[PDB]
């Protein structure tokens, strides 16, 4: 009853995460870098508050969320920063516009298609309850490993799916419409992923760790 | 419109499928598989070209989708041959690497295990003949947001291979929640072979044949 589609949307909508604040007293990129790791603490109990999450292996969960986190807080960069062009609401106390991005090099380049995505996800108007179900399934959709408890993890997916379906079809549009917007809002998820790719290589170029402050987290998971 | 509709779109993307590619040998592996890429990014040019409307959008959308997609491609293209034969990948009818070969060259045993994961996922979903069609060309279609933030164009262009991939899960028979939930399953494996096309690119810039040059001389070409 928890997965029913209705109270899944309700359920996720209290699961969201807080407002994170770095209060700052190379620094862009220790800005961004101080968020993510503060973010981390707050996405972990975001995802054990998805009905059914918990219950997955403490493998899979711990799997699931290594591989997504970069593209959960891009996800959420994109949400807020979505009735904003040419900005990145990252945190409410750090706005950065694109051409902040050219100080750090190779950043102006991630920042272009967290833009340009922030952008598709506009002309789509994308609705608080699609944005609920989209970012539960890019976790759930991080790995293939867990999934080829799997069939646990293979039912929780179509569970998020199925709301989103829901609540795609509450919307009054047709049938051949209802399709395409599914359609429409999935293929964006490639473009999530490839963001979330570019911001990982980038991360992993440099010279805060957030990744082993991540997995110290999962090892206290 | 008539050529984008779903029954006569799939005929015509079965018709542009690539021919076989033979590598023909007289780093090794590496070389093999660089000379492989450069040999079927030709063909691959003459398949998009073949897809209806891709033509008709402006050059530079073209180029855009070419250069952005060609990797996820070429993947997508391995996975659906080596389908049936799990451990294994068919680059090509000279090339058949399993997985352990993967060991010789650092950094190439994650990306096997990424394709040989996600070709597992498309043989558990029973990928189809027409649907792997349809998916193919809405990979190239969907590989660059830009040239679409010709836009009108290659939104319904888009849109028409979807409504050919819709139209090929119905008349699948099952109900209506399923034919959903096949889409949905089916989209959401393309973010895995974006992935796996990142890591590739990846490697493949980490390294020291220039596939990469070598297809921008192609699209000079393509647009000369
Ligand atoms: O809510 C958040 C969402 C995303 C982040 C990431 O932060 C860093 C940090 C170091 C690094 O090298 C790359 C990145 C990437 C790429 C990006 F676009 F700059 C921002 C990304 C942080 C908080
Ligand atoms: O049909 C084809 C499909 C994909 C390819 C690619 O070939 C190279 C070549 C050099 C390199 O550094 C990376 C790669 C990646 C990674 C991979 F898994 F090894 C195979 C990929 C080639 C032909």
Not at 32 to 54: C, N, R, Y
Not at 69 to 96: C, Q, Y
Not at 132 to 157: D, E, G
């Amino acid at each position: 009853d928890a997965l029913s589609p209705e109270q899944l949307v309700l359920t996720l909508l209290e699961a969201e995460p807080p407002h994170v604040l770095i209060s700052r007293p190379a620094s862009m990129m220790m800005s961004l870098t101080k968020l993510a790791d503060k973010e981390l603490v707050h996405m972990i109990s975001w995802a054990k508050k998805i009905p059914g999450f918990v219950e997955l292996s403490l493998f899979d969960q711990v799997r699931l969320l290594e591989s997504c986190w970069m593209e959960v807080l891009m996800m959420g960069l994109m949400w807020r920063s979505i009735d904003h062009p040419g900005k990145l609401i990252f945190a409410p106390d750090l706005v950065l516009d694109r051409d902040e991005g050219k100080c750090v090099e190779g950043i102006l380049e991630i920042f272009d298609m967290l833009l340009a995505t922030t952008s598709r996800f506009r002309e789509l108007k994308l609705q608080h309850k699609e944005y609920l179900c989209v970012k539960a399934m890019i976790l759930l959709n991080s790995s293939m490993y867990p999934l080829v408890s799997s069939r646990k993890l293979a039912h929780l997916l179509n569970a998020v799916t199925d709301a989103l379906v829901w609540v795609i079809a509450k919307s009054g549009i047709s049938s051949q419409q209802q399709s395409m917007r599914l359609a429409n809002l999935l293929m964006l998820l490639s473009h999530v992923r490839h963001a979330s790719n570019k911001g990982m290589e980038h991360l992993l170029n440099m010279k805060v760790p957030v990744y082993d402050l991540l997995l110290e987290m999962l090892n206290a998971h």
